[PDB]
Curated annotation (Swiss-Prot), chain A:
Pfam families: ATP-synt_ab, ATP-synt_ab_N, ATP-synt_ab_Xtn, ATP-synt_VA_C. Produces ATP from ADP in the presence of a proton gradient across the membrane. The V-type alpha chain is a catalytic subunit. The keyword Ubl conjugation does not apply. This is V-type ATP synthase alpha chain. It is an enzyme of class 7 (translocase). Keywords: ATP synthesis, ATP-binding, Hydrogen ion transport, Ion transport, Nucleotide-binding, Translocase, Transport. It comes from Thermus thermophilus (strain ATCC 27634 / DSM 579 / HB8). Belongs to the ATPase alpha/beta chains family. It comes from the Bacteria. ATP binds at G228, P229, F230, G231, A232, G233, K234, S235.
From Swiss-Prot, chain B:
Belongs to the ATPase alpha/beta chains family. SUPFAM superfamilies: C-terminal domain of alpha and beta subunits of F1 ATP synthase, P-loop containing nucleoside triphosphate hydrolases. Keywords: ATP synthesis, Hydrogen ion transport, Ion transport, Transport. This is V-type ATP synthase beta chain. GO terms for biological process: proton motive force-driven plasma membrane ATP synthesis. Gene3D superfamilies: 3.40.50.12240. PANTHER family: V-TYPE PROTON ATPASE SUBUNIT B. The gene is atpB. One of its GO terms (molecular function) is ATP binding. Produces ATP from ADP in the presence of a proton gradient across the membrane. The V-type beta chain is a regulatory subunit.
Swiss-Prot record, chain D:
Produces ATP from ADP in the presence of a proton gradient across the membrane. GO terms for molecular function: ATP binding; proton-transporting ATP synthase activity, rotational mechanism; proton-transporting ATPase activity, rotational mechanism. This is V-type ATP synthase subunit E. It comes from the Bacteria. The chain holds residues 61 to 187 of 188 of the full protein. Keywords: ATP synthesis, Hydrogen ion transport, Ion transport, Transport.
Length: 578, 468, 40, 127
């Protein structure tokens, strides 16, 4: 191993001399306490090291040892139901070892080594194994964890251990060349894991939010960016994604954000139920936490660790949702390190390779055929925290060139307690056309037409609002006034959704379709009535409006009855006016 | 126990000096810089190498020289001695008494920067603090363990609001259900760049209410060194965490004028030529502010707590300025004062729409306050937003053109501003604030209260504004 | 009124004297401890 | 109200401070009385050894001429020069080779740098 000594300490950066032979992007242990760092520059006999831990108290001349291997994660059973640091250290174990504060330098395995897993072989001696095949299986929490061959390993089976209870270290398959395959393998976090083929997204990433699911959808292997100013509802939206999404596994990455949010997830999820599996919600969740006051350089490590774990669970055949709590803080970490490197910045101090890093991160999403022949998918939702809500900033602009959906949060809507606070005028989705076949057979044959009609009504309202705000509602004609009123009904009764309500937190596609159909039926009857000379006030004072206005709080198990009754009542009421 | 002295000063410029043979100075160590006249001034090591060590002098470098100046190590890690006997004392912003009293006997020395709290070691802030102010209690509720700043302006009365909250803050165990007798708040007060007028106001208020015995004061005045402004909140929060999580106290930290903290941070960053961010502020300002703000909360298995109420003056009343912008990304909501309400004569002039509390839901409702709190607050928000929109409409198209429902919303906006927001120096229990709220909501037709369930409307709707 | 302040002043004088008198009974031992630690 | 309690507390704090100042004076006289007490050669030799351990690159030692007759044997054995200087008493100092580093091991300095650490133990002992 290459050994050297510290020559210079500056914030999260250490320069080590005597490191001739150390490789780019290898892990080195800095100081007597063995702090983890990654080499990111070689110069003569020196190596520049970015340290993933606090550097206070280090002295010049302390040892620096290069491990010879890149930053890698352990990938195997034991990751579900867990919370990890940026470099994949179990935080429960860190607490048990160092109390309520995170002290630096703690060495602990990511996967528990004393746990026993029920192993069911799926291979026999003499079988040819290629990268990604399923050697066997172990139950985790109601999931069926498949033990995979590492991507770059080929051979023929020599012996298979029988069904039993084994730890993650036990060699469960031995090949002819002698290579021992265990329940886990290590993977570099900056190398994307290979796949057989990339597919075309054709199914929806159901979220539980009406606005995102209807107007601006995301496909099961797509990418979305949700930028917003502080106070708009990024965290609530992402937590709701985690609680209600139709993904098998959720990897939630708290990159440089509040620690109370991590505590909230840990405390709350163990009591909620997986929408599909039925078990506790925490059991489908992996948590990666590098809070704001944890070391800055570990934000990048957290992003890469999370995306690699998501790829792994995809490789087992799962649909994985990846939430990045803020890519803006990852950009901030890169800017800091480039300040230490003495690099020349691009716009706003960020390094010019920021867009390349973001692109590489987002391109790991996709629906794929795994090396094992099964279908997997990773869906990435990325939170961006532009300063001042400005969308003309490097991070938002670099993200918008690569994501397929743009969920734009608005502070004006959040000020009025309109949530989820998505600007439907400024948002878009490039998946709506591709998901139409799925909608036409899973929601309703005419669902896209209802959705288009609602979008057109909203566009008309947006056109009329500029006129109203300067000349008063009364100056309009009756048709335009009805459009304003129905646009308001859409805002308050369809677009708004209460994340803290026992029923309105989640909304199914059928319920959204029903609410839209009720709104459009009311609009058609109201237009007819206007032509029949009915007063706008009469229409507005009707009692059916209350029925539509409370429809989102009704529960799923009884909603279709409410829906049939309200559809009858709409005609009944507009016949009464005559 | 021995003292090492370095005399190889090779370069002094601005607030930095280079020491040549200082390999045994750790990164982040504290040093004493002795001048030819024997005067000693502090400093921190900010970069170290085999060539030299870069030291950051806490006060001006006037009088230093390369011939008779020596640097001695003080501690490997910047630490602070803390004792329970800190309560009732005054310190100068670096930790030294300015009360004329003997120095404390430390029970322990704690690193001022602190250590991050493990997320698995935290518990959810859930205990509701009653501030006696309706705009906060009903709509922007504060809970123990929260970090809730006050977004202030130049000439606005944010100090008055902080003093009133400190005076009236209570926890109301009767609603929670524990039924045990309360305990009072310890106040840790950190002032950065504070003027004598404001310091006089605070000292007089605390003396008036008797809280100066159960409080710790760190006072960096606007005549005190600028780089020392960076140590003040860290020492304050070290003492706060010590008290809370070793002696089971409930501490209330007030950091007055965090704008001054950010200005000092920019001064240092510009000196070191680090990569800036948005308006000359250092690119790591977000992390630096987080290291201060995320030292609040509540821990599992501990009875004590740390609440933070930072006060920052928004430059040019601009909410998109980097200081307020980054604070709002870290803190759990914000209370924003309105220059317009202040000019109308309203106290406390808290604007609800740009104000938010993110931890309110975990502190209100069944078994905490009473069940209609959240819906009442939501309905008040909807009604006030509509009222402000109608007021915007009226300023163009005149009052006479309004429909009767819109006229109702206007009257609601006015009565809100004049009876809910405006309360002077009164202490209002949560019950009285909710009563006033339902009274204002009764001004609207019972059918327009879409945010409130039918049961609550039946229970509470219909009280007039006859409150006295 | 001033009576409470006078009573408290008397209490303060009594407390100060009591602290001093308690201290005098161990001063040499503390000096010895500080000498043991400070000396090598 | 609590104004009287403030008076009581300030009186108690002032008394404790004065007692600790008395203890400090006792310790400081005890230290300055060493050059008479027959151990004062051995203590200065131990301090010089500690200073030399503090500087790996030590090149010289400094002490008052009175301490020289005891420190000479150590200085010659350790390969470091010795110089007579009316510097601080009650200890020795080591000078680095380049002349820019220096370690001093006076007992007054050690008292100054240990008082804060020892105050807790002293307070627990007294009360």
């Amino acid at each position: 191993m290459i050994q050297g000594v510290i020559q210079k300490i500056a914030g999260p950066a250490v320069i080590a001399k005597g490191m001739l032979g150390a490789r780019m992007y290898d892990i080195c242990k800095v100081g007597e306490e063995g702090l983890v760092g990654e080499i990111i520059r070689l110069d003569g006999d020196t190596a520049f090291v970015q340290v993933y831990e606090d550097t206070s108290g280090l002295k010049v001349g302390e040892p620096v040892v290069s491990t010879g291997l890149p930053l890698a994660v352990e990938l195997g059973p034991g990751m579900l139901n867990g919370i990890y640091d940026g470099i994949q250290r179990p935080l429960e174990r860190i607490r048990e070892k160092t109390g309520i504060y995170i002290t630096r330098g703690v060495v602990v395995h990511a996967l528990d080594r004393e746990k026993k897993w029920a192993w069911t072989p799926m291979v026999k001696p003499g079988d040819e194994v290629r990268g990604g095949m399923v050697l066997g299986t172990v139950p985790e929490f109601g999931f069926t964890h498949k033990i995979l061959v590492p991507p770059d390993v080929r051979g023929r089976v020599k012996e298979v251990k029988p069904a039993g209870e084994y730890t993650v270290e036990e060699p469960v398959v031995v090949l002819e060349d002698g290579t021992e395959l265990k329940m886990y393998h290590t993977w570099p976090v900056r190398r994307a894991r290979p796949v057989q083929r990339k597919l075309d997204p054709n199914t929806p990433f159901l979220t539980g939010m009406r606005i995102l699911d209807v107007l601006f959808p995301v496909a099961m292997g797509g990418t979305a960016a949700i930028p917003g100013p502080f106070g708009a509802g990024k965290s609530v939206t992402q937590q709701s994604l985690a609680k209600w999404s139709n993904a098998d596994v959720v990897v939630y990455v708290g990159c440089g954000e509040r620690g109370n949010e991590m505590t909230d997830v840990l405390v709350e999820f163990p009591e909620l139920t997986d929408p599909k599996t039925g078990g506790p919600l925490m059991h489908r969740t992996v948590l990666i936490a590098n809070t704001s006051n944890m070391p800055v350089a570990a934000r990048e490590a957290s992003i890469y660790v999370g995306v690699t774990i998501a790829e792994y669970f995809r490789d087992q055949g799962f649909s994985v949702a990846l939430m990045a709590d803020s890519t803006s803080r990852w950009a901030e970490a890169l800017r800091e390190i480039s300040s230490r490197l003495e690099e020349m910045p691009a716009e706003e101090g960020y390094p010019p390779y920021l867009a390349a890093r973001l692109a590489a991160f987002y391109e790991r999403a996709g629906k794929v055929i795994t090396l094992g022949g099964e279908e997997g998918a990773v869906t990435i939702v990325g939170a961006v925290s532009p300063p001042g809500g400005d969308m003309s900033e490097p991070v938002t602009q670099s993200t918008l060139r690569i994501v397929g959906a743009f969920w734009r949060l608005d502070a004006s809507l959040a000020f009025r307690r309109h949530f989820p606070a998505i600007n439907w005028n400024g948002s878009y989705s490039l998946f709506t056309s591709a998901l139409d076949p799925w909608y036409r057979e899973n929601v309703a044959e005419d669902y896209p037409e209802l959705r288009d009609a609602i979008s057109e009504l909203l566009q008309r309202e947006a056109g009329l609002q500029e006129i109203v705000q300067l000349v008063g509602p009364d100056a309009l004609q009756d048709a335009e006034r009805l459009v304003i009123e129905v646009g308001r009904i859409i805002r308050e009764d369809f677009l708004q959704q209460n994340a803290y309500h026992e029923v309105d937190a989640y909304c199914s596609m059928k319920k959204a379709y029903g609410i839209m159909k009720m709104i459009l039926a009311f609009y058609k009857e109201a237009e007819a009535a206007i032509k029949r000379g009915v007063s706008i006030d009469e229409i507005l004072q009707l009692p059916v409006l209350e029925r539509i206005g409370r429809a989102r709080y009704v529960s799923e198990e009884e909603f279709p009855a409410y829906f049939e009754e309200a559809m009858k009542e709409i005609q009944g009421a507009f016949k009464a006016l005559a | 126990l021995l003292k090492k002295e370095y005399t190889g000063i090779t370069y002094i410029s601005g607030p930095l000096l280079f020491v040549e043979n200082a390999k045994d100075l750790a990164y982040g160590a504290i040093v004493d810089i002795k001048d030819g006249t024997g005067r000693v001034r502090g400093g921190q090591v900010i970069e170290v190498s085999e060539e030299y060590a870069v030291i950051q002098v806490f006060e001006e470098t006037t009088g230093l020289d390369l011939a008779t100046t020596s640097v001695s190590l003080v501690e490997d890690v910047a630490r602070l001695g803390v004792s329970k006997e800190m309560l009732g004392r005054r310190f100068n912003g670096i930790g030294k008494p300015i009360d004329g009293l003997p120095p404390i006997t430390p029970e322990k020395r704690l690193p001022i920067t602190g250590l991050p709290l493990n997320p698995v070691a935290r518990r959810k802030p859930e205990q509701f603090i009653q501030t006696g102010i309706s705009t906060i209690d009903v709509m922007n509720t504060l809970v123990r363990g929260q970090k809730l700043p006050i977004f202030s302006g130049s000439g606005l009365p944010a100090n008055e609001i902080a003093a009133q909250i400190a005076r009236q803050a209570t926890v109301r165990p009767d609603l929670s259900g524990e039924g045990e007798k309360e305990e009072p708040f310890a106040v840790v007060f950190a002032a950065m760049g504070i003027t004598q007028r404001e310091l006089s106001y605070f000292i007089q208020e605390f003396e008036r209410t008797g809280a100066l015995s159960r409080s710790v004061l760190f006072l960096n005045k606007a005549d005190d060194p600028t780089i020392e402004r960076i140590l003040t909140p860290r020492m304050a929060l070290t003492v706060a965490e010590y008290l809370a999580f070793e002696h089971d106290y409930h501490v209330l930290v007030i950091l007055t004028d965090m704008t001054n903290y950010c200005e000092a941070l920019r001064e240092i960053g510009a000196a070191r030529e680090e990569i800036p961010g948005r308006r000359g502020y250092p690119g790591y300002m977000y992390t630096d502010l987080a290291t201060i703000y995320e030292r609040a909360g509540v821990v599992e298995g501990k009875k004590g707590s740390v609440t933070q109420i930072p006060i920052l003056s928004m430059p040019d009343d601009d909410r998109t300025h980097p200081i307020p912008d980054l604070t709002g990304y870290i803190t759990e909501g914000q209370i924003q004062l309105s220059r317009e309400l202040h000019r109308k004569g309203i106290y406390p002039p808290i604007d609800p729409l740009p104000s938010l509390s993110r931890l309110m839901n975990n502190g209100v409702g069944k078994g905490k306050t009473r069940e209609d709190h959240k819906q009442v607050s939501d309905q008040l928000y909807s009604a006030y937003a509509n009222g402000v929109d109608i007021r915007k409409l009226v300023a163009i198209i005149g009052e006479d053109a309004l429909t009767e429902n819109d006229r109702r919303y206007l009257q609601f906006a006015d009565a809100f501003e004049r009876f809910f927001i405006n309360q002077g120096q009164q202490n209002r229990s949560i019950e009285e604030s909710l009563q006033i709220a339902w009274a204002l909501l009764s001004m609207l037709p019972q059918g327009e209260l879409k945010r409130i369930s039918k049961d609550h409307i039946g229970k509470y709707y219909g009280q007039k504004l006859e409150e006295i | 009124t001033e009576a409470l302040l006078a009573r408290y002043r008397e209490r303060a004088e009594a407390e100060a004297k009591a602290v001093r008198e308690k201290a005098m009974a161990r001063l040499d031992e503390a000096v010895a401890l500080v000498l043991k630690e400070v000396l090598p | 109200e609590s104004a009287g309690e403030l008076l009581v507390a300030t009186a108690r704090t002032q008394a404790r401070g004065e007692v600790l100042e008395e203890v400090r004076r006792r310790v400081r006289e005890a230290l300055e009385a060493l050059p008479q007490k027959p151990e004062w050669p051995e203590v200065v030799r131990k301090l010089a050894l500690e200073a030399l351990e503090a500087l790996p690159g030590a090149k010289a030692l400094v002490a008052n001429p009175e301490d020289l007759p005891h420190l000479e044997a150590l200085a010659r054995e350790r390969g470091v020069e010795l110089q007579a200087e009316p510097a601080l008493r009650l200890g020795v100092r080591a000078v680095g080779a380049e002349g820019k580093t220096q370690v001093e091991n006076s007992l007054l300095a050690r008292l100054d740098r240990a008082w804060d650490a020892l105050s807790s133990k002293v307070a627990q002992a007294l009360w």
